[PDB]
Amino acid sequence: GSHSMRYFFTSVSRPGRGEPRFIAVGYVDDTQFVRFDSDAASQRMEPRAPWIEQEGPEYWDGETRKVKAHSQTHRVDLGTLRGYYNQSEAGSHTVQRMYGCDVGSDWRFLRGYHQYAYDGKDYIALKEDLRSWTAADMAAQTTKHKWEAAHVAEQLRAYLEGTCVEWLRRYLENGKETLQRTDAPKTHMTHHAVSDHEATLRCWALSFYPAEITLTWQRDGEDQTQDTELVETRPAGDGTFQKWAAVVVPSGQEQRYTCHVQHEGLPKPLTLRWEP
Amino acid sequence: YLLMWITQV
Amino acid sequence: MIQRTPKIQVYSRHPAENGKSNFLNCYVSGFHPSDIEVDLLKNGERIEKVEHSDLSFSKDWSFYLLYYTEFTPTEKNEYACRVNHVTLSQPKIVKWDRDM
Ligand SMILES: [Cl-]
Ligand SMILES: [Cl-]
Ligand SMILES: [Cl-]
């Protein structure tokens, strides 16, 4: 299907306690493959997936160089932002940036993006046309005017449509064994009496990849998006994912409820039934 | 593969 | 300066089995800003070789982290996650329930 490459950066000022913390992480789909942390000891972009270990020295030198220049732009950006908002220079502030590209099934450019946040709120974003910006407030308008004059969208657009996609593809070929895999979920159901007239029924999805999944409960075939409890999908820590959906049911009516599981790695969607 | 450079806000 | 309280899940990496080594997971998500204290507890005491994921964040800009340590569950031992954050009036302790 479609695939993504995404870098996320977080930069936090630390007045009175050291230099700004910078953290950078790259992903392909739901798999992390690189990172940089200002506080770590390597001071290098570091691999976190095996296929990226293939890459040679030129590559790691280059990614390290670039991530340090990102760090430095952000270090300056914290100073400017505090000036734009007339903020006392005695407070911890947070900048966030995400950019990346998506490709469709045919591995050709679908979409690009570049978002920026200050203190947890939208500041500026490139719009889907890769040509203009949305600025959330008057400070961001100042950045927008500047970036318009300096023809920044254009440089960014050439990356999103060119380099980004060309390396996404490269990564997908090189890391084919994992990135192009699906791990179908392992599934099962638990029963838990809570009282003489209720039981909690829980649906469990374990060891799946990618993260995208839908667990829904049906009574007599009719959807119950009303009274299910769903947990946010969570990481297993081994590269796979987990999720459950629970439903509290009147006693004696278990055989009427069924769990359905939609995941990319399943031949067809699963109905799990309460059959004694 | 990162951007070769980012521009100041 | 938005401020968002952390959601917390405590779980293991594989289905739990007394006497079989595993990983104890604590997933904090949904929070802002990023400074956050998380400890994994064995019978009330903090465990020492706890590792964590690299800070990343969601579409709404809120943060998430996985903290994790290797362990061998046994029936005599209770495990928890203790999280402190500027949005909390006091540390939140979430006990590990095996048979969620
Ligand atoms: Cl992601
Ligand atoms: Cl830390
Ligand atoms: Cl142990």
XYZ file of C-alpha atoms in Angstrom, chain A residues 36-149:
114
model
C 19.796 12.026 17.577
C 19.681 13.279 21.170
C 21.666 16.334 22.207
C 22.211 14.806 25.678
C 23.412 11.392 24.407
C 27.127 10.639 24.071
C 27.685 9.582 20.449
C 26.737 13.034 19.098
C 25.931 11.170 15.873
C 22.762 10.277 14.083
C 22.369 6.705 15.356
C 20.671 3.729 13.623
C 17.652 2.093 15.285
C 16.625 -0.381 12.586
C 18.849 -3.043 10.991
C 18.420 -2.143 7.322
C 19.793 1.354 7.926
C 23.016 -0.225 9.326
C 23.764 -1.197 5.709
C 24.535 2.450 4.942
C 28.194 3.431 4.864
C 30.257 6.249 6.421
C 29.401 8.989 3.866
C 25.768 8.554 4.831
C 26.241 8.749 8.646
C 28.576 11.702 8.391
C 26.011 13.497 6.239
C 23.002 12.765 8.450
C 24.985 13.808 11.540
C 26.026 17.047 9.838
C 22.453 17.837 8.839
C 20.880 16.964 12.168
C 23.440 19.287 13.872
C 22.518 22.131 11.483
C 18.817 21.447 12.355
C 19.717 21.613 16.027
C 21.452 24.942 15.411
C 18.582 26.502 13.475
C 16.271 25.502 16.325
C 18.629 26.927 18.893
C 18.368 30.259 17.091
C 14.614 29.870 16.529
C 13.978 29.712 20.322
C 15.599 33.164 20.637
C 13.608 34.700 17.824
C 10.275 33.295 18.970
C 10.740 34.706 22.441
C 11.395 38.076 20.818
C 8.346 37.787 18.530
C 6.056 37.111 21.511
C 7.857 39.600 23.859
C 8.496 36.782 26.338
C 10.713 37.018 29.397
C 13.835 35.094 28.691
C 13.378 33.177 31.841
C 11.172 30.290 30.967
C 11.313 26.876 29.362
C 9.777 26.911 25.903
C 9.139 24.157 23.356
C 9.457 24.088 19.581
C 8.299 21.056 17.552
C 8.735 20.259 13.816
C 7.497 17.415 11.647
C 8.169 17.001 7.940
C 7.971 14.181 5.452
C 6.556 12.649 2.308
C 4.095 9.894 1.453
C 4.055 7.616 -1.579
C 1.184 5.488 -2.863
C 1.104 1.799 -3.832
C 3.154 2.523 -6.963
C 5.862 4.155 -4.811
C 5.276 7.534 -6.382
C 4.763 10.830 -4.555
C 1.309 11.241 -3.047
C 1.710 13.996 -0.538
C 4.112 16.152 1.433
C 4.024 18.076 4.687
C 5.980 20.281 7.043
C 4.392 21.358 10.341
C 5.864 23.581 13.103
C 4.564 24.152 16.662
C 5.507 26.501 19.465
C 4.574 25.625 23.061
C 2.188 22.902 21.825
C 0.166 24.968 19.337
C 0.312 25.249 15.569
C 2.614 28.062 14.554
C 3.137 27.570 10.746
C 2.414 24.759 8.251
C 2.952 24.150 4.549
C -0.439 23.614 2.891
C -1.147 20.516 0.777
C -0.395 22.446 -2.469
C 3.273 22.648 -1.332
C 3.237 26.251 -2.418
C 1.835 28.407 0.405
C 1.629 28.601 4.226
C -0.922 28.697 7.020
C 0.221 30.963 9.858
C -1.636 30.579 13.153
C -0.997 34.062 14.557
C 0.812 37.383 13.997
C 4.216 36.031 14.974
C 3.794 33.279 12.354
C 2.727 35.877 9.766
C 6.153 37.477 10.230
C 7.764 34.118 9.511
C 5.431 33.651 6.552
C 6.269 37.022 4.962
C 9.988 36.263 5.340
C 9.670 32.742 4.008
C 7.565 33.961 1.071
C 10.189 36.564 0.104
